[PDB]
């Protein structure tokens, strides 16, 4: 099929500023609008990374779009836990160099309990001493962790790519079975947090002007397609270990 991990380490996206206006009042509407603008910028970076991701080109265009749309919150959350861990030792939520959440911002964002759930994942990075190599393989597994209920157009092609990245994670943990299951348990726990993040995101999207929450064009497109699929139960989370 294929070291692809050496490739993963080099294709990691550059740093993205939030463009946060600290002179503006710290309302839920202003903070969430800034987070949505940041999410739009990260999405462009995800597409650029996915195009050069080994094996991703083999999947048909329709499947590539489905995977990116279904996994956007999973990839975003996981990357947030990594930045929080790397830059603050998981003491704060490191959204961007210019946007680091303390207790105050967690309350102001009107997402306090969700922010705490996210901080719990970053605390697991500290407990496990997650490595950058482990992190890059796991991010690929998250891109390949949610599919349509009726499968993808090229299901066999997808399964081959996913299986090969799982083999890469197993090879990596040796540098071992105990660590492999600690990492798969961490990946599985991403689905529950992402579910709660999407529930709130769908809510603010469906009544955005009523709460003054702005969404960039990229998020409008992704959410408009994803929202009816997720609520109709057409999304299928892939678990290593069924709950
Ligand atoms: C730009 N963002 C990120 O870097 C990280 C990502 C995903 O992990 C999150 C965790 C968290 F604790 C708070 C926010 C986010 N992030 C979000 O983008 C997001 C999620 C839900 C939303 C919104 C954003 N926006 C809304 O209007 C309301 O629902």
Numbering used by the authors: 731 to 732, 737 to 909, 917 to 984
Provide the authors' original text about this structure.
The present report describes the pharmacological profile of AZD9977, a novel, non-steroidal selective MR modulator, which separates organ protective effects from acute effects on urinary electrolyte excretion in pre-clinical models. While AZD9977 exploited the same regions of the ligand binding pocket, it formed a distinct interaction pattern to the receptor. Notably, AZD9977 had stronger interactions to both the gatekeeper residues (Gln776 and Arg817 at the helix 3—helix 5 interface) and to Asn770. These are both important receptor activation triggers and the observed interaction patterns are in line with the partial antagonist profile of AZD9977. The distinct interaction pattern between AZD9977 and MR LBD is transmitted to the second shell residues surrounding the ligand binding pocket where the water structure near Ser810 was modified in the AZD9977 complex structure and Met777 adopted a unique conformation. Met777 lies directly in between helices 3, 5 and 12 close to the activation function 2 (AF2) which is a key surface for co-regulator interactions. These observations suggest that Met777 is critically involved in mediating AZD9977 actions and mutation of Met777 will change the functional profile of AZD9977. The data suggest that the ligands exploit different intramolecular communication pathways to modulate the AF2 surface and to drive functional antagonism with Met777 being a key residue mediating AZD9977 effects.
Mineralocorticoid receptor (MR, NR3C2) is a ligand activated transcription factor belonging to the oxysteroid nuclear hormone receptor class. To develop a molecular understanding of the differential pharmacology observed for AZD9977, the X-ray structures of MR LBD with mutations Cys808Ser and Cys910Ser in complex with AZD9977 and eplerenone were determined. MR exhibits the characteristic three layered alpha helical fold with the ligand binding pocket fully occluded at the center.
